[PDB]
Design a protein around this ligand. Sequence first.
Ligand code: CA
Ligand code: CA
Ligand code: CA
Ligand code: CA
Ligand code: CL
Ligand code: K
Length: 210
Amino acid sequence: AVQFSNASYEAAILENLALGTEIVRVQAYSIDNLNQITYRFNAYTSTQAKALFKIDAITGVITVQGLVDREKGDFYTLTVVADDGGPKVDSTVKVYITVLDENDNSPRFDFTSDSAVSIPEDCPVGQRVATVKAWDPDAGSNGQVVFSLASGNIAGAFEIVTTNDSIGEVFVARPLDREELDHYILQVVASDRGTPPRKKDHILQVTILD
Ligand SMILES: [Ca+2]
Ligand SMILES: [Ca+2]
Ligand SMILES: [Ca+2]
Ligand SMILES: [Ca+2]
Ligand SMILES: [Cl-]
Ligand SMILES: [K+]
């Protein structure tokens, strides 16, 4: 009765790996079987999994043949048949593939993010003055967004609070004075928490009214 070298196979692979990267090699054998084995995926293997992975008929080597994107799917199950090509019932084995995250996305600002606002000079300290929104689809820290006011925030006039790793709330932090300064060009930076962080800028202009 044909057996595999392992009861099941597993691999954790990085997303975005090159076409042709080897994932695992399946190997089956039996002393009382002199047919060359043909390795193949059976119909319990999903179309999605078959598109990303292939198995060599002779070697049992499983390679990447599509674009592996953790953002589209992070786990696949293959069922491999050790097909002897003859009337004996053929053994099968499971292959479990886990896709690990790369920091392959920067924060992207939502088009509803505020670009230009006007506020009067008596806008009180604590008043919410603008809102920005950014999205980062990566996992864990790689997909958590933090906002900052990297330039143009003269005298610490404004502050930005981050909520839900996505929304940036701009508040008045100190009293404003139109004669002192009537216009701000704030460089709002959305950064993820990857190592190193990936960053994107958004310009928010604030006019001070009379
Ligand atoms: Ca990806
Ligand atoms: Ca057979
Ligand atoms: Ca990211
Ligand atoms: Ca990713
Ligand atoms: Cl191997
Ligand atoms: K090998």
